[PDB]
Amino acid sequence: VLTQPPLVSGTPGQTVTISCAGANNDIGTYAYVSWYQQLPGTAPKLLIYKVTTRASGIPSRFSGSKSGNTASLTISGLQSEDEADYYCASYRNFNNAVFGRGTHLTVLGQPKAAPSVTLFPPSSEELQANKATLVCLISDFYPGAVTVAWKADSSPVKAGVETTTPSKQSNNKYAASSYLSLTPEQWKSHRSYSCQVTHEGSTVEKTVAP
Template sequence: MVAVAGPTAPSVSLLPPSPLQLCEGSTSLLCLLSGYSPQGALVSWTVDGSEVKDGVLTSAEELKKDRYSRSSTLTLSKDLWEKGEEFVCTVSHAGVNHPVMFRKTGPTVKPTVSLLRPSPLQLSEGSASLLCLLSGYSPQGALVSWTVDGSEVKDGVLTSAEELKKDGYTRSSTLTLSKDLWEKGEEFICTVSHNNVNHPVTFRKGHCEG
């Protein structure tokens, strides 16, 4: 007999409105579903406990490498955004609900920050990049900066948008270094600024890890 694989739950993330969008007076939240099977995931939205159907646009399901994905956007009137406090995207899949919540105000939770050094394979190919990962923080608004041997570096920095997951916000930042800067540099620091507190994480080439 061939075993039939059970359902694979979706990974769900919620992207809140960007500061630029809010500045321009428009507001939309984006709910992303990925990596699930079988198809048939449904998305619903609630604002302060009441279901909202106006302004919801949900994409068709898309099959990628035996897993499905889809997205849903909730576009809010200025009035509903200003009055609303709690916005929830609920994904229903295989009889299970997966809610992800965004609150405009809430408790402050500092980010967990980790710094991943370049892999030996990458270094052997003559390139070097460091990855700074932020997770589990609230509210949004974490900023990332990089220094090499005490001097701030802006070239080669790519920082992702903030995403809201079940345990808080996440974001990542990659510093891609020239071969020359990597070879000369000794101390590489990713500093996360959140809620007026700095959270630096340091990698030193001269120190063994683990």
């Protein structure tokens, strides 16, 4: 396929460059090289086509360059909102198209943030179904690495814990979920349950009780 760097990064206000190495049967044919931006959960958005031409509504700071068989995407005046996956595509003879693996543009320099934790007790409807789930929701933290610990009263919970990998929100802070499956008898047996989230050495904690 088209060779494209894995990660590109930079602080706001500075320029970044993303390259799209190609061969003679794709980029070398007619230079029909396009660029796309994709945000998580959404379809790619056409930025540039035919190497240099910008689509309607695309700002001028996005620029299309090409030299040899390699095209380059230049993003001037980097914004925090510019963090996305950027793909290049090229026409391939005959009547074929090929995409690069993609490059993730990471906007760095944001301050560190403690996680906001929200803990939900089991719903009255779920307890009626003879089930119980504690929903612990972590959000708005940076860097994206937290450890989640569950406590029954003060004893650690040795089973029934499922936890996600931290993922970046639309504000480029991280979020994660943690679920504790309990029997309704266990949920009533203890005084309270707690979701302890550790981030950069400190711990944020929420507590629910039957």
